[PDB]
Amino acid sequence: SDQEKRKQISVRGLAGVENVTELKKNFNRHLHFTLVKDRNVATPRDYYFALAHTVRDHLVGRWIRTQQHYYEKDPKRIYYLSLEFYMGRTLQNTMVNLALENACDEATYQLGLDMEELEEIEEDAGLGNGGLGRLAACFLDSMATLGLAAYGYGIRYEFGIFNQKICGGWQMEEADDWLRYGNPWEKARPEFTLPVHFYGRVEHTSQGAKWVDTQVVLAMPYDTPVPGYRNNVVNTMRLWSAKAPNDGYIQAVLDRNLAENISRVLYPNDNFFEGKELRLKQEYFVVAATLQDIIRRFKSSNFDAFPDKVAIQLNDTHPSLAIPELMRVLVDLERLDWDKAWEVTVKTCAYTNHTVLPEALERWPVHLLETLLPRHLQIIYEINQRFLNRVAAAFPGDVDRLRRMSLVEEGAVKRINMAHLCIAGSHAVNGVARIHSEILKKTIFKDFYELEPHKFQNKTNGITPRRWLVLCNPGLAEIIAERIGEEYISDLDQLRKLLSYVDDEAFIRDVAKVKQENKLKFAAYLEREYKVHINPNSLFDVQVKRIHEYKRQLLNCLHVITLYNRIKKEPNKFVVPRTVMIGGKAAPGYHMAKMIIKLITAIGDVVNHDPVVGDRLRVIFLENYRVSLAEKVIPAADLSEQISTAGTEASGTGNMKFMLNGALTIGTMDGANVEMAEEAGEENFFIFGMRVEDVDRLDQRGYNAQEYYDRIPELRQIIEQLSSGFFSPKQPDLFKDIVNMLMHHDRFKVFADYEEYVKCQERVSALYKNPREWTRMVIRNIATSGKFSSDRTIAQYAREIWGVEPSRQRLPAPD
Amino acid sequence: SDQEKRKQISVRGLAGVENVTELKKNFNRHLHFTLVKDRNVATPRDYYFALAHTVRDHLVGRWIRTQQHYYEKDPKRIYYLSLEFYMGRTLQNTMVNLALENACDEATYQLGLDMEELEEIEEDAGLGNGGLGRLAACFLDSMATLGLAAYGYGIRYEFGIFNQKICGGWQMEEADDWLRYGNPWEKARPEFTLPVHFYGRVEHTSQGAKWVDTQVVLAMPYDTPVPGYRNNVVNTMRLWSAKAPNDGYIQAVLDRNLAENISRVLYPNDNFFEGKELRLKQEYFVVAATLQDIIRRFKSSNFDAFPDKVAIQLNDTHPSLAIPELMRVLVDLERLDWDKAWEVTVKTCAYTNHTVLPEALERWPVHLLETLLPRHLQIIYEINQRFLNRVAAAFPGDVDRLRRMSLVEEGAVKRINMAHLCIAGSHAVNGVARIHSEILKKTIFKDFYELEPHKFQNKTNGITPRRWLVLCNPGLAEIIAERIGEEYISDLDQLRKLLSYVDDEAFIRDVAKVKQENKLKFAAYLEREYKVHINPNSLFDVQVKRIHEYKRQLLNCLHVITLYNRIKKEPNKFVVPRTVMIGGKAAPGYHMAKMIIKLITAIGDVVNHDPVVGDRLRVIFLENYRVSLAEKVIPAADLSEQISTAGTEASGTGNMKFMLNGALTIGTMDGANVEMAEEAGEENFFIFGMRVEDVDRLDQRGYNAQEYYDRIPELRQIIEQLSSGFFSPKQPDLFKDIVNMLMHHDRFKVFADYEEYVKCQERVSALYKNPREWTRMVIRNIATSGKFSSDRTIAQYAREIWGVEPSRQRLPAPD
């Protein structure tokens, strides 16, 4: 067979040019041949798919070229391991990054279809809980835009974060069947399935340890392309799916599901550790399959150069088993001596920490590890002993420090501290915001910092300006581009140039106009799909993020009740109208968080129907908060609520989304809020409350909520209302748990920041009364938000941790 | 929005002409855009998929046009309900029916690929057990070729008939993961999902019965196109998949699998009833979803005309619940009076019976029905009472007949006789071969025939000449076409014209040549994938079909042992060399059938390694017999073994496949064998053994196997060898169960036909010694096989049962 003939098999002149005529032809081909429909039976959903497949074609052509480029060049490859990737919708993002939205708009118009309506049909890919998962998605976009040979590796959950329904003011969870109609963006790769082992026992041969009698589960990969901004670079996100191997008869076949349950559902916990076996299986599953893939790719173009061609970033401790697994492969399978394998491992791995809350830290009981992964437990103990021997050498006689730094925690229930394991086996450990990285060094990881100061770094979080500005706020993007060009989209620091228009009346008018249109649009979306009626001239006070005690939605609640009581006291006095919106999901088994949601809706029941309040105050709970809803509400916000107790929010990212979209911020000196105020100037930020040091003082002497109750009349009145059933007539003591918690068991000191919060909120209202000054402060915010672009964050990771150089060089088009 | 614009959305000038240039372009598009591969990483499997998708495009264009045609014309629609559809491979069949194989051959050649190698990569769609499932697939091909508006409705099993492995001579079952790499022929239709109810209770309202508190399982359809032979008609096969509705949290999500287990696996029983709950769920599942689909289609272009636009054919009693379900919908939901609904039901339904063996008859215990389908049990009792009242009127005082005809069977375990239910609610009941249809009237359904003689018919089975001649035996098809043209492919009766070449030396030579090449090819396939070495000059003695006691593979075994003992007795005497091949799967829990497989392999262990036997006798067990293997072995056969006990094989279809492909038949006067000998002339058939009447005589007086053992020395010697461990040295009494069964509990009288069988086999050997005469008899067989084309069978069903006229009119091409 003449091999020269196969040269005809090329992507060389395929999808056609990105002009209207060709797009329509392809749309037509997909509607008929791909979906097997015709114009008579086709529904909007069918048209959405035909368009998605049409855009996919162009995306795929570049995907193939990028992967070919990497094979040829063989650059150092970056593997971002995460158990969460909160992607959201893909159609628009793809059109924008490929510069296809105009042609698609035109092509669909000529066919008698409306593209914006089609886009709203796409399901959100919710394979994440919140900030951690969304950060991974932003990073993927940035790594592609910066031309890095990066791969995101995770799990392809059949069901993502649940859909939230509000029934009788209570949250109800509904499985998120996001794959029901299919996912046009993913490509199954059954030919690349790999085995993953569980259980079994370790037996010692003359030449080494052997893991035998193990149960096998197959890992089948699904590839999703991730496009960079107009550089023709398309990277890969590889998600693993669990499959049972093919080796009474009926029952045996039915029992295959047991193995496939590993990738069935995403654990809905945000910043909380649940030590369940299934979760541990998920963690090893993603790790074992991923590392096999990494080693194979490395061997296809000894291990001394592994760290020069491979960098593995661990997103939190979830994929931490990658350390002992890499050691297992190198020592047991490749037969490298321990010290050499360890050297390679440490130089390859880097770990990112995302929280300081003790209940979020993964500490796995050893009994679960010895039965599920016997060989890894052995390796972990060995790692521990050799690590502790190093500590003893640097601090002779410090037996206390040895107990504190151990990877193994004593107590009746022996547990393995996964964070300690990550620090020991990583060459770099980073926090996600300056204040957080400092706290890591001053507190929880103080011992580790003293031993290896060089390991600790900071990499302040960021968000991608493509989805979080260009995509969700085209109106804002347009007026900014008309003054400074389009270069800021991949170089956000250029927003700085806007400081020159702070006094320009034209700009001031335009910024305020874009915001009003966004607010009008949002109020319309609310009436259409969720029936009620907010006043579009009120101040849009928004707090959207997962429901958590540390995020203090309750503090927000106390303020709106204060506002309501104030109006009732003096009904004929003027007040800046406000629409207070709070949204977010609560983990299913988090009782207090679910009680907080009920309190929010109960407050709205009273306030929203009080005739003397009228249009001056409206409290709305936005149900099913997710990425696509964030894209709608954030651009319509005036005030962003970032009120976590100082020292608890590692960084936050929603805060950056709001800053970039023209909302002013009211918050504590926590996480990235510190750096945002730093960039915009503290006078252009609404800061209040205790600083980290003040929280420490209170803790030393002891927090007594009663003191505040006794000294603040307005606060006392609120608690009295809550206990008397003022917000729950048919069940007077419904909120007894919330009241008791605030009075006697509040770890987040809500009462301690109440007074400063209310006073600060008063200043916000004062400034809103002056549109011109409000808008001028907003411009000072938008103009200094450049530091918070994920392109900056990724550039720092690449240079300071991965040892690779970013690049904006564009690759050639398929043809 | 100008609706005129949408007229651009058409299939009108799409796939391009069916010439080489366009095919290559599309192949290229699919390899890159559909599969996301390139010429560097593509494997043959990838190339196979690219070709399949390319051919699919042309198939889909006609599919859409056919469905449009039916909407316009609104012809009476035929619904073939079956729990099995044994489809086999689809690529080649599609190319042949669309007349694309030459262009595809050329296009692939020019790309440097070999099409025959690509075709061998396709997985068999094994959603069937054997004859019943394969008949449904042949019928689908014929209904399309005859231009009928037909739909096949069944279940999309995740795992079809198991893959059979032989380990140590024993059968081992392995799950058939046929969807592992995907199915390019099916199209998921999540938008057409329908609910199916289970359990619950019946409550009586003032206006009627209501089925409430039921559990819901969703039925999602998957459509597969089925092309007719060159008429551009593409029908639909709709297979249902079970899905759980979206309404601790983790466990709740994991438990969704329980509902999806309904369509997980095909029960591997052939002609045997297993009363398991899951099976019953499967039966109602397919029925409930299908009928909803039928009613919807009917209402979209009152019920008095239902029978004029709808015909429902029940393939065996598996889909029998369609009768009480249709009644439930018409009475409970549409509120028709009972008598009118019943009239409509009977006129709509027709039932096909496939077996007479009592252990194959479905008799469901009422306790299972009252808990799973309470409302259907009520309807069935009502149906029974009104049916029995009719019997009493026609035969006053015949209380015995009333007990015999009842749909309800008394005994401790009350059961519902599904066959009686089908007869009562169908306007037509048919057997599948003349002798079988007669037995139905003379025995098991005698009572029903006396009450309604007009209901009983016969519809002799057939096979499709496309797959069973043109596809699997191109060499034969070609030499036949060179003398009589290509019109026989859709009018098999034309093979008759070949009787004019019985004496032509050229033809005689060609027929014998085609067979030798087929045998050479098969012997090559055997050495390649299954290593051993059969002599291609020996007589190919083949028996392939499911392992069953009634099919009497054991009788075959006795003959080969007789042959072996004969050679050993007189080693230097000449004998016509023979390669005896036996293949077929055994149901997992059928102990005796699994013992028979072991006996076959044990016989081969001895015979195949006996040096004095040499190349004169070889016994081979063909493992994993399935549709694609049948396509390989049948065309290479010389002798077809159809030796079931007279009166047990309803029809048989493998027998017809062998006749059409140049093999002579040795068999009993059973099933369709009677009609085949009738068509070819009994002198051109090797008939032997008891006729149905002789079996009846033996039964009356009593079957005593000992008599034959005592009177036949050669038989006695064989049994002695089996009991002594001659075929199982390390375990002397391994075959004790087989020997005891043959001697004391043989329901199929193997010994009674032994003598005539051996004598008849002697005549076969005699004729084979004379190639010229052997081949001339073969021609007399091939030339008279026309009656056994499924086109004939379907034509008869359409005219005599469905009330629709067949048609060979070709529809216009897409463009």
Ligand SMILES: *Cc1c(COP(=O)(O)O)cnc(C)c1O
């Ligand atoms: C940005 C984002 C988050 C993170 O919000 P924070 O206020 O940092 O906690 C959570 N959920 C979604 C859907 C997001 O878009």
Ligand SMILES: *Cc1c(COP(=O)(O)O)cnc(C)c1O
């Ligand atoms: C034709 C066919 C059958 C039916 O064979 P019989 O000899 O009629 O029992 C069974 N299995 C397969 C795979 C078939 O092709």
Ligand SMILES: OC[C@H]1O[C@H](O)[C@H](O)[C@@H](O)[C@@H]1O
């Ligand atoms: O690092 C991304 C996010 O991770 C976690 O969700 C932290 O709670 C949050 O503060 C941070 O922004």
Ligand SMILES: OC[C@H]1O[C@H](O)[C@H](O)[C@@H](O)[C@@H]1O
């Ligand atoms: O009707 C199709 C087939 O159904 C069953 O398999 C019968 O056993 C067989 O005789 C018949 O040919």
